[model samples]
Target chain A: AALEPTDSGAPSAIVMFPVGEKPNPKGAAMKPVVFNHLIHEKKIADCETCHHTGDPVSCSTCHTVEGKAEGDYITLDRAMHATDIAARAKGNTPTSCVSCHQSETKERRECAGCHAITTPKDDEAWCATCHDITPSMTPSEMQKGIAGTLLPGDNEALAAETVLAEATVAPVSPMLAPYKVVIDALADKYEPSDFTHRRHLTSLMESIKDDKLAQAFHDKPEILCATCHHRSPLSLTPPKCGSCHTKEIDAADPGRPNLMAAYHLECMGCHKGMAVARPRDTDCTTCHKAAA
Target chain B: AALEPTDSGAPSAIVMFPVGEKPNPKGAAMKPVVFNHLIHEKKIADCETCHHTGDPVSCSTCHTVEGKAEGDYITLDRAMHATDIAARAKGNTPTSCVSCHQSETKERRECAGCHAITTPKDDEAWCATCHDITPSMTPSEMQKGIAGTLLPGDNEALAAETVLAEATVAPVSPMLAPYKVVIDALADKYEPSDFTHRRHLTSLMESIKDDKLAQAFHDKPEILCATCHHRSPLSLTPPKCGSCHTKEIDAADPGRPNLMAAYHLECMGCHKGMAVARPRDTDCTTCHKAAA
Candidate 1:
């Protein structure tokens, strides 16, 4: 018995331009990658966990050349460029183009795989068969099979599992030590912000420290905040913002600021400064909210 | 007496494009903004001083909805796109479209002024006619009194004069308190980098330090190291690189030494980390190359 097309047609809007050598009467069908948003959304706790800077923006940003995958150094150019077809097939590190674009393990063979081949001029009515204005396969329906499907052993899954683990786990010593030491030391001097030392420390230690993979990468228990807190172990004080900001804003200088920047530099800066194994510093509202 | 058409006719092959309005077949002109590249170039130190990263890649990044100049945060689009005839005539900060595109300034205009306009067409040409591409222009040549010279004012000249005077005449401080404090502390821990505490200190204190502008801006008199050895106050044991670097590299799970980064981050970091006042930190070879 013949099988139905099922739900396996292309997920994105098919652009009908023919590309490359083989000229098809029907235009090559280019579609957006079938992103399993549900899998990522379900695994990670906070929306910011994956929807960094919100869903539409983050999706557009990450899917483009400017924003690379989290924690990976790959540029957007390398991730999505159409040229690296071979690299894309192998699920290259930092996610290949095929990883995002193609849903099947089988190699793409059709002319549409490489080009935007449109329908023939004579068969204009035939174009409506595929291109009738209708909703594409929504994210919800596409991800239904993923439930309870054991994630194949891989680095991407493992990294994702780590983030998922971080969501539920309590504060561990190693991860929280640096944050606690610095936040506490600075908190008393400045206006007290809601730096829950207990929470972050507990989570970092448990999720990262306890994990075998984390231990494999970072040997030793995580007591040493220096891993990320860094700069000096002997010297108790962190680099002071006032030490630099005061000079930046001179009185005669139209651009200079008052002590306000000195204060904000320490508060906002520490939060802004880079830390390994965490969200980027630019995602400021993650730590501070209007009320909190 | 009316001059011959040849005397004032449009220069050969020069395209007279319209600014505020579309080019009239009659060749009626629009005004243009008089931007001085040389003066602006000298005033601003680095490319980053203006074109910051946190902006859209195109003209819409700064301009208003309809592509008018954004008043306070003057949208780059309008600044580039505005056809405001009156604004262009007024001057360089093109208030109107015509000021920039129209050939002649309201007053005495030079050929260099008009030709200096960068366009999509004039991609290649002899460099000298445009820029003073002859090595460096002498003070006299630079002072050729173009219409919009934007020269440094008397106060700045006075400041420079005062600096020269102090360099020759003022008494220098005997003790290099700040530099001595920082260098002495870091010396034992790592190989000593050559630092001329006396030379830099003398220059800052005698000439730059005593100036009314410097005094008003810098606040403290003895804080010379605040100029370069910024980040921390003058302490007995200033935080050195190895103190932090050893911990940071070790943390990254990179087991070997990061000696180069250690030294550079400590020295050049302080130099670059501090704002504005410089003999920049990148002027590394200045002290090191000479010493080595």
Candidate 2:
């Protein structure tokens, strides 16, 4: 049978389940995985890569958690969250969400540095990121409801409406005045780097201005600011880097590096991720010139 | 106060200086306004859209045409063709290719069917298409060697190499065989809608498979599939309609519609956009027979 393109346009997100399961199954701790469809759609090439059966059908139809005959007894949990999925044959690469994302972070230089050092335990916190589902129905009812939502139809307007509603970000004006910031917080040995504050923001904005994918995900102008000024509420007047980060590392909080390390990590981390050529990590003088 | 998210990205084709200008003091008739910059960093969003200020640093830097005091007088053609333009004043809306294309095509449903076009126009044809230019130098030199030969900058060679290398497309296996598509998942009110899957896919591939711009951005085979069977991984087999969508409208998932609405919208939407009038929005019987 030739597969016709379904009328229901791409969904923004999908709620994944494990067989005949509710998001909050009796004493089940994990939330249902809400796979961000729009984001991932922009990344990959084909539907068949995941849908090995060559049909646009939900994984639950075949792979129930409790081994269904239709699904070749592949449990729904393994269908979604599996890591070491074996190839059915040569050139067939089967992957679960976790497995694919983990590999992507490892392979992509932009994602490699941060993800390489971070341990992926697949713990409750990590699981909750994708699986934060809240439903008002029992397990069976919830499953039924999910099935209803995933049907094929003209979902273009619906999807677009959802994207607009969910992805609308409060706009912020980029600072117009060109100003340089001399980072003198730790200006003991060399003159602090002359930071092109407005230039940097302007350039960053320029790069992503035409990127629909980036625009959709960036949610707010301040979200870009969160790259450096993270761990706080989003605002134009975010607390200074030094507010929470002291001169020295807090042994109690090993996760939080010292202020100097914070600066170095954030700056160098982004450069490496973005494959910035100049101002090499070893070239301290490039940023920190001799004090005048 | 806020930037309305502009529909923007790199242009498939551009016509520099729609109206010629006498930039040179000698009143030289400009060699038919030829300019090319295919390998500008698409990695960044609309970064170049605003950076077109008058500067003689790099043609690839900014100015690509004959030398003039203010940016080689490149402003003439760029004003019209460069869609991702900067605001000329406060409250000014930046122009873009998509916006112009959108507005031009918005009311012309008759033209829409024929004009939903693709592919970057070849430099010569594009140049001719916009304006006629008879270069004093040999045609090849004028075409390829104009920037580097006339200009004395290291960036010229860079632009030449970048344009030639980046402007080609890689081939992919479009659907080889056509199949009869029967969407019988929810056929209560109407008989299953028979779709010509092969014909549709073939037409889609025919239109864009060879287009360099489409090839450049599509990145994979499944990307085309995403136009309809979206929100899933690239695959020949996608999830069944019934798997995600149900017979009834789901209130819980307001963004999604019932199977019937999905079918109607997707088919009708494409048809209407393409100006297909036979199977009109209300003429449901044209696509499917009433349940027998």
Candidate 3:
């Protein structure tokens, strides 16, 4: 039996950075960077050689904050060499030019005559890689080692809040009360998640100390942290999904999303909202699995 | 040569009552009124038996406010037994019911059951009598009117306070600002006659006092008058067609409204907004005429 692959070819080297404040507040100009995959492929044979499993990974894994053989802040080894799967797996990680541009020869900046490509002009049919064209009743097969331990039942994706609750982070600080009241109502019967203000601030403040960009932006102290974490308090790893949502053991309302979606939305929505530089919707393991 | 009359014998009727108020709000309690047209036809049987030069005239001319023997109200002589053409004409106007009621005993208050034979089904379409069908076009017409008067030039319908730099009026008041502004703009030059605030309000105030419905609803003093009259106090009327628009207008442009539209919107909009009670907009002459 032929085993089919469900992965689409890695996207072309050219990346589209959506024009907005988070990505470029001073509107840092970026001419289209036509990365030559063909030249890099000579040294690196596979797409994953640099892209990792998928897009939006942390760059510290391959390069360094400061170039002490990928270092000063942390060498590439300290970043990417972690044995833990959750820490090491580049599942939708965050990265920047400075991370990989450790070698002075690497071109880090330039913008002239960059352009977007037009859609292909032909009757070619485009199909998603994961969609099954042929009907099959058999469940999808899992890969070895990849199918490691099922996380603790409480921490499992099946946890109540993970499956049921839907969170809407605040668009602005003052607007948090109304939004929390509304989403809390939608969670219905579930204890309202304690949105911590202090915990988030401490961590963000520490993270920003070395990050020039974050230091310049995290203005207004207490109020500014809420801009990204939104409704959450200053401290605390914002409550996980299970804290607010209950798993639906058996139901058929399409309007009600499953646990996977509930989790993805909170994590993805916050990450995107905060304007963290990384891959967008394609960053999967950024929130999944543990290192070996 | 079949020079047939356009009247496909579509029936007509007349209604007259004391000027104070309707005897009853609901026809459920009133007895059926008897209206005999055959008897009326026997007296003066020309097609003009009911029409005035093939046109309908104001019904109030003879339907006096009180039973004043044709002084302030129609006399029984003109109501039931008049023979002179002018006398017979009184019975023909809307004030008399039997002109076409041909039926003797018909309920007068069951509005939809009679006038709108198809009830409930197209109650919305009934509003089309005054509100033009182009739901999308109406807003743009308003936008044009706004852009017109506010911009510049001779909008005859609009009167601006600046335009009033040349004239003055006695018995001054603050409420009159909208009118003066419009009139001043109207006198500026002949681009197209924009009906300014002062001109329109002057006419509107007069009509309301005379019209039972308007007198009842629009007595409130405020800028609420702009609920329909629209545009700025600087220029009450909308600008002329050539002011901001082209003479050879393209129907495709949703924003473009032509000359006739420019007038009809101001006129019909005011009437509908004021809730004038009558069969209006049945023809162009309802608003515009040959200066008669």
Candidate 3 has a TM-score of 0.22
Residue-level lDDT for B287 in candidate 1: 38
- DockQ of each model vs. true complex: 0.01, 0.01, 0.00
- Candidate 1 local lDDT, B1-292, one digit each (tens): 1111222221111111112211122211111112223333344454332333333132233333212333343432234433442332332333322233333222212222212221112111111112112222222322221111324342223223322232122232535243432332133334345566565455435534333322322333423333333333332223232322332243222543454564554445444433324546666445344322
lDDT at position B38, candidate 2: 37
Candidate 1 structure quality by residue, lDDT tens digits, A50-94: 333344332333332222345132233233332233333442223
Candidate 3 lDDT over A151-199, as tens digits, reads 3331222222211232222222332322221122123334333444344
Q: Which sections of candidate 1 miss by over 4 Å? A: A1-292, B1-194, B210-213, B220-223, B233-262, B265-292
**Where does candidate 1 chain A have its weakest 10-residue lDDT segment?**
A11-20
Residue-wise lDDT of candidate 3 within B63-177, one digit each (tens)? 3222243333443223332222233334443222322332211222221112222111111122221122122222333333323222222221122211222121122233544
